[PDB]
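Standup notes
- HV: blocked on the assembly model, inputs below
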Amino acid sequence: SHMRILFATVSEKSHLFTMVPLAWSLAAAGHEVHVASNPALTASIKSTGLTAVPVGKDHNLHEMLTENRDSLENPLSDWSTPELDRHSWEQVLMKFKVSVMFAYQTYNDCMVHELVDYARHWQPDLVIWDPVTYAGPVAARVVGAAHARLLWCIDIYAKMREVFLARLAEQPEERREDPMADWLGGILGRYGHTFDEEVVVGQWTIDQIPTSLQLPLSLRRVPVRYLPHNGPSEIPDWLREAPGRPRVVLTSTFMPVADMINTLGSMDIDVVAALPPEEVEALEKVPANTRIVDFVPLHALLPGASVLIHHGGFGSWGTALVNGVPQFIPTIRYADWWNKGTSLHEAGAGLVVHASELTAEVLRESVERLVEDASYREAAERLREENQRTPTPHDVVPVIEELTAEHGR
Amino acid sequence: SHMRILFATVSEKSHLFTMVPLAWSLAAAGHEVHVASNPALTASIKSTGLTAVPVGKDHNLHEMLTENRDSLENPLSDWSTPELDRHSWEQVLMKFKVSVMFAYQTYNDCMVHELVDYARHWQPDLVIWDPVTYAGPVAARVVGAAHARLLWCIDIYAKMREVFLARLAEQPEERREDPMADWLGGILGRYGHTFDEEVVVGQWTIDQIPTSLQLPLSLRRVPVRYLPHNGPSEIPDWLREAPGRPRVVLTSFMPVADMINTLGSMDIDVVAALPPEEVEALEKVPANTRIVDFVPLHALLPGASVLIHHGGFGSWGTALVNGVPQFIPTIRYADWWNKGTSLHEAGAGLVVHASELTAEVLRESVERLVEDASYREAAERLREENQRTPTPHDVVPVIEELTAEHGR
C-alpha cells in the first residue's frame, strides 16, 4: 500500500548519509520518499539521488560551537554514562535544559514551522527522523503521521530520557519541570495538539546499532543492518594496488594531524589519510608510506585493512564494523563518540583513548597492538557477523509498512 | 548470498537515470553495487548516491552527430518497424553494419577493455547493462558473471535482431555475415572466449515497459515497475499552488517560442521546463505560463492534464505513472516514435511527426487530450498496468535466483 514518507534531518551531512540506504529501500518498494532539512543541506541531499525539500532557514550552531569551543566538552555535555546512579534530579534536569537551549532549539526551531507546513501540504503517512531532529515528530504529530527515529547512535538520548523521567517522578509537584515538554509541547500547543512522550523517542526506533552494543530500553525497536554510505563516491585507480604492509586508514588542543602523519610515516605500515582541503597544506612533507586524499570510498577501501583511526562518527565506525576492521578512536565525550569507542574497547574489537592523552607514543603503541594482537581482528569479526545477521533495509520494509498502518492515520 | 553487482551504461545521463531505482533496490538488499561508465558520466553517477567506476576514455559521438547532423533521421536509423515484411536481408544487414560501426562501437570501444579489466579485478557476480552498452555483457562473459539488459526502451533492438537472424538463416554460407558477432566475438576472442547470442540480448531482460506496450519476443523477460528518477531533484516553493484549470506541461521543429505563444492563448495553465538559452530566445512569457530550467517532474505531474515531449523515457514513464495523457511530436530516432505510437494505438495519447507540428495541430491536439475523456481513461488503464507490475524491491529475489542459475 503506497506511502508518502518524509525523512527529516538536521543539516549535517554525516547524519544525512546514515539515512540514505533506508530511504532508498523504501523508494525501491514503490513509496514516495522526500528528505527535508535546512537549505544548507539541499546540495548534499540532491547527490544522494533522493528528492530534497528545503525548509526554513540556516542556523549558526557551528559558529557557536567553534567560538565557544573551550566550553564544549564539560560535565553537562557528557551524555556518555546515562545512569540513575550518576544523575541527581538537578544534574539530569540541567543536562536537558542546556541541550534543549543550545543544541536542539538551534538545530530545529529554524525549520520546525516550515516542516509542519510541508507535512500539512504533502500529508506523509510516515515521518522518519534523525534522533536529534525533533522538528520531525512535531510535524508528524500535527498531521497524524506515524513516525520513528532512525538511529546512528548508541542510544544515550533515550536512555538519558529514561533517567530524566525516573528522577522527575521523585519530585514534588512544585519542583516538576520538563524542558522537552515545555519546548515541544509549546510548539504542538500552537497547532492545537498535545505533547506525548512519543515525540521524544518516536513511536518506534529503527536501529542501525548491533544489539550487543546498544543500550537496552523500553521502546519498540526495529533492528536494521547498517549499509555504508559515506556520500558521493568513485573508485580511484590506485585502490587496486596491494601495499605489502598492514594498511592503516585515518579519517577526519589535541595532537596535530601533521604529527600523527609523521609518526605513522615512520612505521612498517601503509597509510591512507582522508583529510580536508586546508589540513592537506598545513603539512610539509608526505611520508613515503602515506597517501593523502580528500575523499575515499571507505567501504571499498576498508576490506583487508588493519586499522581505522577516527573520532567516532558513525560512517567510519559502521563501515569499519561491517568490514571487520579494528578501530582506534582518540576522541572526546561529545555526542555518542565516547560510547562508540568504549563499546568496541569493552568488546575487545578496538581501542579508545581521550584525544587529550594522544601522543606519538600512544598512537604508535595502539596501532602496533591492533595490528599484532589478533584478538582485535577476531572480536571485530564477531561484530561484523552480528551486523550481517541483522535484516537489511530491504527486509525491514514490510515491518515499517505494518507499523505505519498500526500507528498512523 | 551477498553479490557484487556491476551496472554498465554508455555515458548518457538519460540512460543512467533509468537504472537508478533498480541499482538502489539491490544495494538495499545488501549487495555491493558499482556503476561503470566513461569519465564524462562520473559526476552524474555520483549524484545518484551510487558508487561510480570511471572506465576508459570519452568518445566523440555527439561531435560526430552534430558535425554530420543532416543524416540523423534517415531510413537506416529508423528501427521503429522491426518486421520481416519490411526488411530484406540486405536492408537489415545494412542497419546492423551501420549501427555497429557508427553508434555501438563509438559508445563502447572507448571503455570495453578497461571494463573487462575492472571486472577481472572486482569479480562481479552479475552485470546489469543498458541495452546499447554491449561492453557490459562482454565484460560479464569474460569473468563468467550472469548478465541482463535493463530496458528503458520498447525493444526494437532485440526485435530487429530477431529479423536479422531470420534473414541470416536464409542466406547461403558465402553470403552469411554478422556485424555484431564479428565485433563482439572479436573482442571476446582476444580474451579467449567465444561469441554467444546472449551477449546481444542478455541472459535475461529486465523490462520497465508495460507488457501491453512492448514488442513480443522469445527471451527470458523479468518485468519490473518503472519508478521515476529524472536526476537530482528538489521541491520548489511554487509547487504548493493548485492551478484551478487544466495544467499542460512542456519539456524540451516548430520554434519553441511559437509553441509557448500558442499555449499562452489557450484556456490552460502552462509549465515549461526549458534549458538556459531557449529561455532567452523568447520575448514575452504569457500570463498563463511559468518557465523553469529544472522541475521535479514526478512531483509536478499529479493532476496535470497533458505532457508534451519528444518521447524520452523519463518524461514518458513519469507521465505514465501519473496517468497523464501525452502529446509526442517527435521523429523516428531510437524508440521515440514507438513511444508515441504505442500510446496513440492504446488511445492514451497522440503522436505526430515533429515536421508536421503547427500552431493549429498543437492547439487541436491539446484541446482533444483535455476535452475527450477517453484519453485520461486509457492513460489511467496504463497507469494501473504499471502499478500491477512488481517493484524493484519485489524482483530482487528473482534477480538473485537468475544470477545463481546463470552465473559462476
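- HV (later): unblocked. The CA atoms of residues 65 and 71 of chain A lie 9 Å apart. Chain A touches chain B through 39 residues (CB under 8 Å).
- Next: hand off to the docking folks.
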